[PDB]
Design a protein around this nucleic acid. Structure first.
Ligand SMILES: [Mg+2]
Ligand SMILES: [Zn+2]
Ligand SMILES: [Zn+2]
Lengths: 801, 62, 114, 31
RNA sequence: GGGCCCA
RNA sequence: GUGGGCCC
């Protein structure tokens, strides 16, 4: 029956065919096309080695990495069966190299046991090429922490922990140990101290090896590195190094063991720096978190609570008087201000527990960024200056101690262009980690979570805003594009966008879909490649080492910084900081990365049209067998996409006009691949129940940015009109976060802002869907008694000027 | 009368917050669990049951 | 110029930190290893004249603070003072499997090294 | 927030469920 | 400058 | 706290 093979036909999928009846290939194969319900050999090789009992899967959420995190257990069960085959594979590369046998390698010959036979199309002579082997079995290696072996003394499972000494930091020898243990024959480079990397492409390369080469070593090892220092006499101690688990060692090359007349900026370095605050206070430990902890600032643990919703009863009467909120009516009320107790903070901070490192399967990211280049060859960036940033929104926070005194306004106004740019210059040599504060939200909504928010220090983001804010703005107003950031719906712009996304999709139908728990499950590597990609425009203002040190200083600023949950010191394995300057754009990039993954492992485990076959074949022999940044296969694919699978994007909202044929063949996107992917690449299950698929372009999209869509008449021909959910405006008008509490001045703007939102219901068949609008009209006139008062403009907002 | 009494539960837990229940932890935990369950109402007999429970504690105090 | 204002504030901060920094242990362990650089995970771990254990329940405080003194990962500690997630004093006597449901089950347990 | 108590009072009086109203009567006696 | 909606 | 449309 079907055995899953990597064929070299050139790809990897199912094929109808002392040993094991299943192979490591069958294993990773069911790992990596998880079709829930159709998830067989996954479980087969789990239960085969007493990793989990099938009766435990009669429970819900067994295959949720977000509820029931016990699957950590089920999967870390098989860790040494992973490890053993990796080492087998290096010793096999040996026993080929000194055997004089040059043929390329594959796992179907490799047993679940790990071992090998069947040397059939091998040339006799070497360099036995793994690259498929690891380009296969790379990301699934943190999926168990398979190399937990090396953390024991004598790297044996049945032993105490190695007490590594509690002062060391380097371990580069050991990093190379795991490399040439596992990567002796790795025919491409290595730079576990990645300032030695070739370029940003090799940065992604080697720090994607510091991931695996940092699972095993303890928390005592990593983090900032501290030395004693002397200004104006007296001692201090400062993190004048940092050990990233991805970037390895880094030494601030600009140090001052002795100093005098320290500077403003130098205090901007040494104020929010960690150790000054850390070792200068007490200790702390809470059994609440699974997270490692370090410390306390103040010597009392703290708690904070919620003040639940307001109520707006005048309007409540004004509605229900006319028979709103009636029995049998689909005018119910749903959305409200929940309230939460003091355990909230730690009880979502815990959900960082679902984080886990990835091995971004490296050549595939490398080619995908070879793809995204031309999504942005239409766009342009580069370093810029303090005095040519388009900054807004400056009345805002600036960091942990910097909370205590002022606003970001001060720091944009105080730190001169001299100041902020000299900082920009220091930061591209060195590394200064800082503090993030996790807070909570007062969003009227429907479900009962809290969805924590993050805030970082202004030192980080001010550099970051000087850095990337030319590329964004090249896209913040590029209309007719793929993206829509800056592209409103209004004035029928949504309409022409729909016509644009269509523009000869062949067998066109619409699909849409959304991410559960991205801000916690975010594999940090993807954040790395994004902040790199977002800087390829600096090719006249950044050298390559400066690129590495940029990358590192941001990865310490916001990604793996130290978290202050209450008065409690921790560190963050990862997860986006939702207050970051580049959240939505980075996540957009994230979205296309997912998009192409769908394209590809659609097109990999899936062909007769030889346009398609040559396109996947030269995929295979672009990735599995080739390396180079090449524009031609790139643009072949790229226009193929833009013809046949044409798209628009906002940060998770992935709207897709696409071809049913190719989508029905295994070329292009369907939800199932994404579900599988984030189940094997982002640590989540994406249930199609929240996704949708409209098979009629005439009927507009079910979802986008909290909007559905319909089809009506406009000026002698029919058009698509978007329209909102009434329950949202109902709740938000009926429930306020202490806004109309202040005056009635502002709330005019409140209700009318809500009111324009849903004029398209006036165009829709149901009556009280319409009298949503008529209620609002009469309420608006009820207010104009005290004070668009009519529907005058509310129609002209879909007649483009 | 399911919408209306959900609104009732909400104002009830509001004024409950107004009088410092959070200071006595599990008291706040109970009331919060009650209301987070009350807004999920489908059968109203349970809603009335949970109402009278949430009432018992307002009534308990002076 | 609030630049100078926050500047004054943060210099007062970073100066007043030293009121508990010059321990003489700091030098006693910088002079242990080479080139004056080690992590920050373990710095106020081992300058430690204090330890605060925040537990959830009674099952934890039992298996954690067994007695009035214990050891914290191969190093000894003396139990001084305890409170119970809302800062009302408790005793080892009161903390038992009997009167578990009159606790704010979590406990802040400050113990001191010998 | 003074009107909050009053409007909840009228709210409950409108709810017109037997148990709630009997216990309001129980409460009017401070019982 | 204020604020609604959205990621 | 982030960037994005809207309006005042
Ligand atoms: Mg969506
Ligand atoms: Zn390198
Ligand atoms: Zn540059």
């Amino acid at each position: 029956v079907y055995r899953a093979f990597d064929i070299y036909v050139a790809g990897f999928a199912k094929f109808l065919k002392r040993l094991t009846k299943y192979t490591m290939a069958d294993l990773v194969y069911a790992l990596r096309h998880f079709d829930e319900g159709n998830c067989d050999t996954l479980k087969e090789i789990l239960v085969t080695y007493n990793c989990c009992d099938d009766d435990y899967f009669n429970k819900k959420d067994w295959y949720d990495f977000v509820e029931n995190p016990d699957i950590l257990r089920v999967y870390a069960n098989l860790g040494e069966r992973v490890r053993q085959a990796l080492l087998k594979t290096v010793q096999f590369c040996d026993a080929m190299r000194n055997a004089g046998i040059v043929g390329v390698l594959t796992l179907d010959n490799q047993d679940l046991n790990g071992n090998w036979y069947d040397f059939g199309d091998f040339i006799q002579t070497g360099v036995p090429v793994v690259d498929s082997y690891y380009s296969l079995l790379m990301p699934i290696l943190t999926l168990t922490r398979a190399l937990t072996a090396e953390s024991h003394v004598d790297t044996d499972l049945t032993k105490p922990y190695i007490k590594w000494d509690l002062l060391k930091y380097d371990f580069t020898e050991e990093r190379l140990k795991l490399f040439d243990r596992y990567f002796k024959y790795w025919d491409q480079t290595y730079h576990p101290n990645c300032v030695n990397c070739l370029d940003d492409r090799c940065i992604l390369h080697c720090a994607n090896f510091n991931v695996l080469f940092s699972t095993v070593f303890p928390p005592t090892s990593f983090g900032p590195l501290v030395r004693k220092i002397f200004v104006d006499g007296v001692p201090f101690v400062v993190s004048t190094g940092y050990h990233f688990r991805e970037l390895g060692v880094v030494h601030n090359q600009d140090v001052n063991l002795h100093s005098s007349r320290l500077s403003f900026k130098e205090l901007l370095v040494y104020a929010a720096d960690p150790a000054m605050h850390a070792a200068s206070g007490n200790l702390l430990l809470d059994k609440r978190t699974t997270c490692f902890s370090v410390a306390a600032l103040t010597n009392n643990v703290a708690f904070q609570t919620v003040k639940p919703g307001n109520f707006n009863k005048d309007f409540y009467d004004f509605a229900v008087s006319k028979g709103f909120f009636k029995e049998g009516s689909s005018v119910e009320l749903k959305h409200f201000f929940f309230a939460q107790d003091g355990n909230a903070a730690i009880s979502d901070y815990d959900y960082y527990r679902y984080n886990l490192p990835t091995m971004c399967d490296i050549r595939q990211l490398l080619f995908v960024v070879e793809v995204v280049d031309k999504y942005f060859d239409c766009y342009d960036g580069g370093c810029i200056n303090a005095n040519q940033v388009i900054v807004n929104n400056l009345d805002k926070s600036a960091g942990f101690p910097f909370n205590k005194w002022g606003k970001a306004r001060l720091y944009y106004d105080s730190m001169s262009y001299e100041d902020q740019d000299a900082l920009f210059a220091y930061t591209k040599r060195n590394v200064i980690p800082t503090i993030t504060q996790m807070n909570l939200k007062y969003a009227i909504s429907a479900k009962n979570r809290a969805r924590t928010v993050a805030g970082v220090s202004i030192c980080s983001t001010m550099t970051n805003r000087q850095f990337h804010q030319k590329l964004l703005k090249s896209i913040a107003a590029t209309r007719g594009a793929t993206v829509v950031i800056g592209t409103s719906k209004f004035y029928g712009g949504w309409h022409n966008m729909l016509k644009t996304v269509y523009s000869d999709v062949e067998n066109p139908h619409l699909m849409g879909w959304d991410y559960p728990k991205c801000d916690r499950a975010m594999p940090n590597m993807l954040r790395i490649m994004a902040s790199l990609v977002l800087a390829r425009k600096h090719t006249t203002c950044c050298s390559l080492s400066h690129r590495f040190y940029r990358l590192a200083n941001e990865c310490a600023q916001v990604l793996s910084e130290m978290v202050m949950c209450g008065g409690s010191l921790y560190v963050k394995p990862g997860g986006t900081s939702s207050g970051d300057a580049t959240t939505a754009y980075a996540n957009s990039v994230f979205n296309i990365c997912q998009a192409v993954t769908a394209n590809v492992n659609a097109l990999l485990s899936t062909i007769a049209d030889k346009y398609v076959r040559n396109l996947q074949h030269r995929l295979y022999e672009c990735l599995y067998r080739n390396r180079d940044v090449d524009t031609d296969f790139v643009n072949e694919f790229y226009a193929y996409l833009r013809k046949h699978f044409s798209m628009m994007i906002l940060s998770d909202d992935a709207v897709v006009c696409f071809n049913s044929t190719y989508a029905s063949q295994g070329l292009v996107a369907s939800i199932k691949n994404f579900k599988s992917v984030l189940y094997y690449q982002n640590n989540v299950f994406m249930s199609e129940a929240k996704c949708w698929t409209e098979t009629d372009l005439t009927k507009g999209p079910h979802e986008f940015c909290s909007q559905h869509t319909m089809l009506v008449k406009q000026g002698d021909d029919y058009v698509y009109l978007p329209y909102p959910d009434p329950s949202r405006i109902l709740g938000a008008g009926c429930f306020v976060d202490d806004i109309v509490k202040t005056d009635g001045t502002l709330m005019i703007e409140r209700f009318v802002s809500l009111a324009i939102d849903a004029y398209p219901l006036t165009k829709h068949p149901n009556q009280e869907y319409a009298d949503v609008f008529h209620l609002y009209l009469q309420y608006i006139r009820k207010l104009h008694d005290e004070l668009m008062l009519t529907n005058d403009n509310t129609s002209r907002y879909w007649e483009p000027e | 009368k399911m919408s209306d009494v959900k609104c009732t539960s909400v104002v009830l837990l509001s004024v409950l917050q107004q009088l410092r229940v959070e200071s006595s932890s599990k008291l706040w935990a109970q009331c919060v669990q009650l209301h987070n369950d009350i807004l999920l109402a489908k059968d109203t007999t349970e809603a009335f049951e949970k109402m009278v429970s949430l009432l018992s504690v307002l009534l308990s105090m002076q | 110029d609030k630049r100078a204002k926050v500047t004054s504030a943060m210099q007062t901060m970073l100066f007043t930190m030293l009121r508990k920094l010059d321990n003489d242990a700091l030098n006693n362990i910088i002079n242990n290893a080479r080139d004056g650089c080690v992590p920050l995970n373990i710095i106020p771990l081992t300058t430690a004249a204090k330890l605060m254990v925040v537990i959830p329940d009674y099952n934890t405080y039992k298996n954690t603070c067994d007695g009035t003194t214990f050891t914290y990962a191969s190093a000894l500690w003396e139990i001084q003072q305890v409170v119970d997630a809302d800062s009302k004093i408790v005793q080892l006597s009161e903390i038992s499997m009997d009167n578990s449901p009159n606790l704010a089950w979590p406990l802040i347990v400050t113990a001191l090294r010998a | 927030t003074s009107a909050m108590q009053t409007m909840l009072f009228t709210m409950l009086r409108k709810l017109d469920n037997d148990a709630l109203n009997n216990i309001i009567n129980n409460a009017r006696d401070g019982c």
